[model samples]
Target: EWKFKISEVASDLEVPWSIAPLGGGRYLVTERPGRLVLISPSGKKLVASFDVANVGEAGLLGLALHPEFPKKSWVYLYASYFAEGGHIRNRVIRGRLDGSTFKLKEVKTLIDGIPGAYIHNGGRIRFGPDGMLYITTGDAADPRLAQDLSSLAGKILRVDEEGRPPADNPFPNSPIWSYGHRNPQGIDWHRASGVMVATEHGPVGHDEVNIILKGGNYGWPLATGKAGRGEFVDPVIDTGSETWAPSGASFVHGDMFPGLRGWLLIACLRGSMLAAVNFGDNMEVRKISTFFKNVFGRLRDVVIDDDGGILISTSNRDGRGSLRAGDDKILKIVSEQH
Candidate 1:
């Protein structure tokens, strides 16, 4: 399913924030300037566009479809919405897609009042193996907000489709599955191992790949690459914050590919590569190294398809570092065996 031939499908976006493949040659894209535009199968037309609230790092950033979409006709939009007192906020809304148009029927407030900032507002959503919704969040640049459980800033939240807390959550009536995060860019459940893992941006020198423990506090500003803390769940692997800004990730080789199934694939933003981390059967983190070091620019997201090729999203429009005009794109990596 993947060939790694990353040619331009479409370009000239003002500030492209997120991209989601809408099965069968279509793509849904979010521009930071308050628009949800759908690209046609042939990549010629901007089929549909919707108005969104664009605020700093808040504007349309992440997108997800129901696991059973098409039949379900469900589409999820995660973006910042205008709140009272001139504050921009974030929320998740669900809508039904009919042909090229989206009829937003309900807007579920999964998490709200997350301080809006121009940076560190994590925007990623995915459904875990447990059939629960997982959302990545940033502290909105305020350190104190991360420590406040009453606040939704800087945490990995787990909830049901109805935006309700899961009964099996670590904390009673708490939608927060884990905390002490700087800015979680990507999250997903390793299909083969059935474990939840997340990728986060470090303050200055400790980007992390954390295996989320139930009710785990990761010690964000406190512990980066140090040893085990008292009660906090330490990260499975930590890369120096200065060098590599690790973003999205995926696990390859499920029940199908026994050889490569449990290997972790991570996309690096600062490093500009696709890194791979090996793990043993004992659940221990093995050799962590970089792969395809010079292949990408500001890589932001990664998804492993059913056919085993890896899909990567490029994010060069953030204006954080260098800008690659028409460089923001979706690339694929084909398997060696197949």
Candidate 2:
């Protein structure tokens, strides 16, 4: 029985979706209503707001800071925008943060034209160990798009900072690293092995934790969990009946939580909990445990603090969960002894 402590960091957030740690104990948080705020122990300050096409599950969604951060000060944003003809598209933008004003400026579009719907936008972006940007995209409510190689939807895309395909990609002149993903929301590289792992949302069940591979096809419309026929790669961990609706994930690296170091912490939406997964030497899951089930309704994302603590954002205000006094909050998870 592993124990931990949960503390409310920031409350009264309006459907906080993703958090990007901005060093010095400050973080940039995105709300589904298209606002970006800088959060710190002192208080929360509104950073900037975008004219996002707020719909069902689309809006100001994911945020990432340049790996070089302060030196570069480049901030990346993913949001759904109303394109011409009333169609919605998920777009990526790169901008520089004005230190004096605490506002975003010099914004430029990096990529767009990705199909977007009310749900399954797969709007997570992270810089991998290789220093390249990896993005998760959804099928846009169209299952067939998962299997379409030419479509940018329902794929894990790898590109340079400017949204161009890397030279050594699996396919020449293409950014699609892998395809057939339903709604992969969580992605993190293993601390030791450096292998990329992603958590995907299944239809009703069959949620998956996949060890992402180059040019591999993850069975989506054709298969869900295990397609033993060798047609598609199976998931590392598959929940057949239970729905995790897993979102952003991170690997614990600090020593404050001895048992948690090296463990994969996944934030759950429908399960309303945090999953601590211990992986074996071969990179397979050795054990899995759930914490804070229903204690924080509808987790949207999980990020790690410099001191080994975990930061999770809530999604209760997004309409799926009952609204508590602080319907959406940033919760800090630490060792109980602390």
Candidate 3:
């Protein structure tokens, strides 16, 4: 499963934080500084731009295509900006692309006012199988907020297509699906089981891989790795005393890596690799391994592509790594069998 060949898809990118495959070799890439780029067989083009706070690690971060894709040509974005009152916050906005011109249009703001900061904004958005928008939020540099139900920060919020909290949400009239998270960045569900999992950026060295439970309280300032405390949920795999800086994650599928099917794949920045977690028949971490350590510099995201390939983005241009010829790049990975 670890055996694979890497190919360059695009290069000279500036902090490509997320990637959305639109099929037919077309892609929507979000540059951290606010550019929405469209890459196709013809050429790379800037499709749109948002007024984003490009400080620390904040900016345009996550992108996800409408489940039906071309049937709707709609997409969702998670970006950070300064509000009128002068506070930093992140919002989830839905945008659409013209069927032909590929022009990106911001449709509406689905949800807003999730507290944010330059460091821990938790800007990952994904459409769950239930067809609801799932957003991860950080504590906005406030540790106490992680345990506060009133604050949108430091929690996973679930909302419908129109930003309304579903009737069955854990909190009445609230979008908080689960609270007590520090900065859960990467998330994905098991394709076959629909069970969710996530990667969290810990304070300093305790980065964590967690099995995200409904309404579960994952300790933050109160707890870190292996909290064995009865009050909070502990991480499935906690990297002690070292930071991976894990980002976008997804469950593997398709023939690109037959051995990796159903396993969780995460992109690591400080670790500079793609890490995989094997769940096997049982829904627990059976093993963990990484690929492309330091070889690609710092990785920002790793996504499963449409045609049995894994798409990975580099973050060397994001102010934390040494810049090479093409400091930031999009790469395609496929198994030798392919």
Candidate 4:
């Protein structure tokens, strides 16, 4: 059973990509115009905005705070910008947080020098339990890139915060962790399972939930889910057309609650739904449930809160659905045993 409703927090944002809740009850949101907004708990402050890259699916997309926030007080962002040849390039940057104000601090390219396209950009970011950075890159709509081992496109990349490849990577001298992906916009670490999981989008039908394996080939161009194609690992689960555009995902319990530990909450953008899946031994999935149907218009990001609630960002302004003044918003969904 669901235990929460839609509460209007703030809106009129230009293609809001992601929303992150900061300490002291403040929230940070990114609009496609390459700007960030800060809102207080009472919605009193429009604190600051920054110039970012706003283009086709390429703009300020993801926001993440340091795990040791407040002390280190650093926040990270992901965005696509115009580079050489008028092409798009995406990068990750960090800034210092000063008592609700974000100072443009150091900027480092975690995974730069990768080709970027207008579509299938896959701009999502998060840190894993091992304190390493994890990122998902799309094939930029090219099928060949998914199978290219050297290319970062269409793959899940793992690296240190400074853009260095993990020493224990499956492939030495390469940052390519896992290959064969379409456009994956969501990723998170499942500490309970001791692995990371990511959500991906299929062209028309084949949306997938994948159990990420280092240097594992996911078999993209040669296949769709469970088709047993070309030496690629199949998705743990696949969803139907337009209904499960799975994007961002998060598991809760703070490293406790073993049974409920590896639960996965996948966000859907096209379908505007949150599909919940449980992870068990050997990546087995069970009890897949969905909530926020027809109530929230296009779920882009999902994060579980300390209070056993989940915060989801709606993307009604993505030019794919009907728009309203405040169409895009943050939704809270509470889950408990009935």
| Residue range 1-338, candidate 1, lDDT tens digits | 32234445456664555666665546676666666667654554443455556655567777777777778776776677677987666776666777544444544555666666767777787778777778778888886776668777888888887667888987769888888888887787766678788888887767888888878888876667645779566778776545678877877753334556678878777778887777777568876766666655677667654455566777677665465656666665554444
Q: Candidate 3, residues 294-338: lDDT per residue as tens digits?
A: 888898888888877999999999889988787689998978766
Number of the top-ranking candidate, with lDDT as the measure: 2
10 residues in a row with least lDDT, candidate 3: 1-10
Error of 3 at 72 (Å): 1.8
**Per-prediction TM-score, please?**
0.87, 0.97, 0.97, 0.89
Give the per-residue lDDT of model 4 (tens digit) for 106-198: 556555656578788787877788777777888876779889887888877777766678789888777778888998888887765677788
> Which prediction has more favorable lDDT, 2 or 3?
2
What clash pairs does model 4 have? 34-52
- lDDT at residue 311 of model 2 (Cα atoms): 91
**Which runs of model 1 end up more than 4 angstroms from their true locations?**
1-16, 44-55, 99-110, 253-260, 321-325, 335-338
Indicate the residue-level lDDT of 218 in model 1.
Answer: 81
The candidate with the higher TM-score, 3 or 4, is: 3
- Error in Å for residue 178 of model 3: 1.2
lDDT of each: 0.70, 0.89, 0.87, 0.73
| lDDT (10s digit) by residue, model 2, range 1-338 | 77788888899999898998776678899998999999988999999889998999898988888888878888888899999998888988899998777988999989889999998899999889888888899999998999999888999999888889988888879989999899999999988899899999998999999999999999888989876858799998889998898999998887668777779999999999999899989897898989889977899899998777889998999878888887789988889888
Q: RMSD for all candidates, in order, please.
A: 3.2, 1.1, 1.3, 2.9
Model 2 spans > 4 angstroms off: none
